[PDB]
Symmetry: D2
Subunit: 419 residues, 4 copies
């Protein structure tokens, strides 16, 4: 496959970075097959894109029937009842105070993008506040909202005004909830007025930021100041959504609820679909024709996104996600005594991660974290990187992993840490 | 259905407007079936996305075959062979001087968005110039690039700086090529320096602008303008691309070649995929990791794109387009004499349109466009509106439409213009 | 001590970004006469760029400044106010072309004046948008550079510039741009760039200063007034250069039946002293909260005292009528020189804001060289002339309105001789 | 009584946006003494907000301005230059702490100076980024408001604001904010807001003026210089308020071994006249092309003549040490007052830029009411005190460095007494 590696280097730009050396041929559940027969259990699931697994039999049958019905029709002209079919369901499952309304789009960056458009149309305000280490997409506005410059926005500036970043709460790094809230106070006193901020966008637990959970200390306080200053709270559950946090949405772990929320990735279980759900009054702010997109709500994707929403419940992967999470929680917790480089492990449900620090100084180092990288797939196990420094392994296995599938990779994960 | 629509209003926001309120059941080539089994000839193809028709036997077989393989990988992690030489297949076919390289994404707005990121990474310049009436997407950057405020960006401002709009040459409306070039010179002397403009983006034929073809002298001068000031000429062929204009890409009708090209819509023939092609060195300007997207290069959509390029070649849809549109153009000019409202008949290939003005004045009638919209509606024929005044009908039938199906629709079209 | 020594010391001590036009350095100035450090007497047709309509060191202005010099030179008005600030504001409120009650705030520079007009407009409407016109000049600060409609050289190298700022086309039917063309550009901005319900103000000069002395037609101004009336936009008139008797009236807006919502004043406001101001409808001016407006030097006591005498000199010496008398005589000469000099393509202006445009006869393409040759020969004859326009082919005549009749006659003789050569 | 008729006139004729601290109007000022129109004599501890380090109407400054009145008041330097501009730039180049050859460009207002500083930095680096600190104040223009780190009341209602402008945290160990706290706030801006190689300049005051007189530590200024050296950033020191003998040295940056790339000057640079300047490395200053920098009032000849005399006064009267002597005596009084005044939480400053911060004794919470109480009590006893700070709980002391010691001792007697009550 070495010749195809170079066939790509001369046909697709260097900007599309790719981690693993080998290509894909077939995928099942959480097991990937290379071109050369190698079998690797997927602890990545394409970045939380397949909570219900690679090619789950139900929605693969739901996309097959949806195929010979219609593949595309542009919902803006000819609508389909499968669009209203899901908008009904998520409006009943989303943690939004009062009546909820849902619009669907294609990519997750478009969901956060449209949440900004709806937040701006309802508030009439320009301001948008995110947090350091937060990731919200790769388009112009979403890169501005993203809190990691390299490599996400290196060389694509300048970026629009009225967008600033607070500090995300993180007791593991010595920043408290008060430290986080004070950075917001410093933005209101130096950057932009509170009555000029349209929305505060927030990952319930940060995805590419290092799997750091926001405390209920932070959320209830956050809900308070936006209610004071007329700001809308937006929860970005593109990565944390759909049963991986032990519950359907990570915001269900909290008592107060966001006015808007963006969803994608495993929302369709491996097919291009995003969406925005929120309060009926705020979502109804843009005028007709203001929201759209050609591929918005791909009929095959809404059919699968309907399907995972049945695997949601009959398989009950919310309860399983807490059972997978808590055991791998234990595997790395006595590996903590065996492997000294572990400084902390964190996660809710099975959205779990482990941070590794070099012993001489407690600074990160991604090449011990990334020493585990190679040993894992050397054993046929694909683990993804994370963090502001690259020092955190995030475990993104599908929720549909058989238990023998899991314990294999778990004890293989026991061998990567002591070598 | 009556309940079906009102279920749709309480579940989905008013922002996502919809044209027809009959909901699709079935789709095949250029035929659409609705809740009541009523057969409608499709002259929209979901906005030029189904150039090869609804569910083409070749691309479904390529899509169903890819679903036996895998759902999705996040190309960023484990890549495909599907991705690479679909790009090799477009690198040789795209009108790009010298070696070409191709990256793939999902939505057309993303392709335009990434074409800007590549233009910014290559030139280090912030500036971007588009034209009034142009449409480039609905995200923050693409809304600023779009040259129509209503309804695509009412309530979503403020918009970023260094984005200005020239005037598109509309020789059928008093705007010459010299007028259009002077608008660009006026931007250079008042808005932003030329050596600060990274790219000039335009559609070879304005899609929602009214199907205004760009004259050859305007494109030649545009090439020399960017050549003189180090600007990159981006061609937005998301709507004009893939055999609709008689040739593969609309830029092939000109001797000048753009530095960058954006594609989507009929690229995958009813599946979510976009892409950017251009000179090898400029597209490699972004750093590894700067370009990305989780759904980018969807395996099924890549397999669908592979067969779409097969279909238009073996079925000779490039040559078919112009003979479909030539037959359409002459029955429009036959009705030109006994109908008083036709003021112009624009189009190239099968990207044809006809503009209506009120007979007593020169103040266009959307109603007459809606009235003729309301006649083919009750007569089983779906066509779209466009133009800055909503007074021109665009003919976006699938190129795969059978001859008897087309001859019927033109008959129906002739009757609705007379009355 | 000597000029070239000073020129070298200048280039080694100051940055090249501060360009200098003339070879010589000033030693003494009075009315419309300049004496360089070598004794050469120069007829000033620039007046510090339309700053000394009342002439250099007018006795009444100097006597007013010398008097204020024995009281106080600065107290920071936002800390300790003074009567002269209030009285000058009252005088401006009466004379300003403002519909209804007016209020005035004083600042230091014309760019600060435009800046505070923008700030006032944004506070009242709550909207980001601002629309100017190509060829407009409104200052060199970040926002005023964005408002300025000439990239070279005011904006080269200082980008990127803020959003919600766009430029229409200023009408000059002497170039093929009608009022209808100008309004078409505005409606194109409204349909492509920014919605009219998001534009706070439209800003234009009644006569474009360095834009070539192009006069806004009443056609254009009335349409702008109704357009802003319909879409809730504020009409800001930048009279920094046109203001104070330059155009035959105290303010160039008085030539029109249309009144602006806000107006910026500077340059000739203080007759050679640092002062600027904003006057407008009281309801609009009161939009910013206490503390939102200011500036340390704003309303300098010496400059406010000077502006008091300037308004006095304009009235007591009838300088508005003088500007019309002088300008009519100037257009008389420039148009007689039309028969003897084919390069003259246009003679435009109002009052003593007169200009002449030059083309190369071969085609209708500007001749900036012929413009420079006229400047150099006038300098050779001791006459300082400023160029302007988008192509540098326009010579503007900014003589002080107090220029003696005999000196003006000699300058016109120099003008006729230079135009034939 | 008679001031009330003037206040009603002031309220009806000028907008409410120009706030006014004192309800009395000045009639005469001299050194550090103010006389209102009612005969009341006030000791000036404001000096027009640090504009009069040399005092109100200093004899040598007035005689220099009066000499310039008999020659010329304005020619626009970009048209006809003058020698005094060059010689003042030559003096500023020799005196400014700039590594290597320096160049100086003069403008009018402090905001204009900062505005041209970013224009020079943007032209030199080609980068859009600008980083300031919360609590910083740099002017009231659109760009300087964005750079200003205090939203109320400076930018309330004037947004939206331009991108590529972010605010770090200014170090104040008295507030629990270390230098490490400050440095890492910059790295978070690098990691989340804008790449370091896209930041054109980091701008800071050596001592925050309106921010509460918080002095930058030496290790913070050092790491800032290293930060900019690594990433090609330019270091800009804003010495509009700290400049010219206020801090015990001619420039506050001279208290450090670090030298900035650019420096802005205003306020007391001309000792009570509208003048501002930008001095920096010659290579950096020459980045803007000819015609890119300017301003009609820039380098006002009267204000330049005053600044020439201000420099002579600072040297002839040894005002740098006098500022150190007056500031030490003030800190002694304030520290002795701390016992019978539990509200005093801190005594900050350097030289004669000393301030005192007040806290409500129950919780360490600011008490602007107590601060205003000290202000109003001192005003009743004839002492004019200003407030600063992010929370308005800081009183700053900006007496003219030329204040007579008997009047200074008297002012300290009042200050002591209004603090014991």
């Amino acid at each position: 496959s070495s010749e195809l590696n170079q066939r790509r280097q001369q046909a697709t730009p260097r900007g599309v970075g790719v981690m693993c050396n080998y290509f894909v041929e077939k995928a099942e559940n959480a097991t990937l097959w290379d071109i050369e027969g190698n079998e690797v259990i997927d602890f990545a699931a394409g970045i939380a894109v397949l909570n219900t697994g690679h090619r789950h039999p139900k929605v693969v049958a739901a996309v097959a029937d949806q195929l010979q019905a219609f593949t595309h029709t542009a919902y803006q002209i000819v609508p389909y009842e499968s669009y209203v079919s899901l908008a009904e369901r998520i409006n009943d499952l989303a943690p939004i105070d009062g009546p909820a309304k849902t619009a669907f789009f294609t990519t997750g960056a478009e969901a956060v993008e449209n949440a900004v458009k709806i937040a701006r149309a309802y508030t009439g305000r320009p301001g948008l506040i995110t947090f350091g280490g937060g990731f919200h997409g790769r388009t112009f506005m979403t890169m501005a909202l993203t809190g990691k410059v390299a490599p996400y926005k290196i060389g694509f500036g300048p970026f629009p005004g009225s967008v600033y970043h607070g500090v995300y709460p993180n007791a593991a790094h010595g920043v408290t909830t008060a430290d986080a809230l004070k950075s917001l106070e410093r933005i209101f006193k130096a950057d932009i007025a509170p009555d000029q901020v349209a929305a505060i966008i927030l990952e319930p637990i940060q995805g590419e930021g290092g799997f750091n959970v926001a405390p209920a200390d932070f959320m209830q306080a956050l809900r308070d100041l936006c209610d004071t200053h007329g700001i809308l709270l937006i929860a970005d559950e593109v990565q944390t959504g759909f049963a991986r946090t032990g519950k359907l949405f990570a915001m269900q772990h909290y008592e107060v609820k966001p006015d808007l929320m963006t969803m994608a990735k495993s929302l369709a279980g491996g097919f291009p679909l995003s969406g925005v759900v929120g309060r009926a009054e705020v979502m109804d702010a843009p005028a007709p024709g203001g929201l759209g997109g050609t591929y918005a709500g791909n009929p095959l994707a809404v059919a699968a996104a309907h399907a995972v929403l049945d695997v949601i419940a009959e398989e009950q992967l919310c309860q399983r996600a807490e059972q997978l999470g808590s055991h791998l929680q234990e595997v790395l917790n006595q590996a903590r005594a065996t492997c000294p480089a572990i400084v902390d492990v964190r996660g809710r449900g099975s959205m779990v991660a482990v941070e590794f620090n070099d012993p001489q100084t407690g600074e990160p180092s991604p090449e011990f974290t990334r020493l585990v990288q190679q040993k894992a797939q050397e054993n046929g196990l694909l683990l993804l990187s994370c963090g502001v420094y690259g020092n955190v392994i995030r475990f993104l296995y599908p929720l549909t992993i058989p238990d023998a599938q899991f314990s294999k990779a778990l004890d293989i994960l026991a061998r990567v840490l002591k070598s």
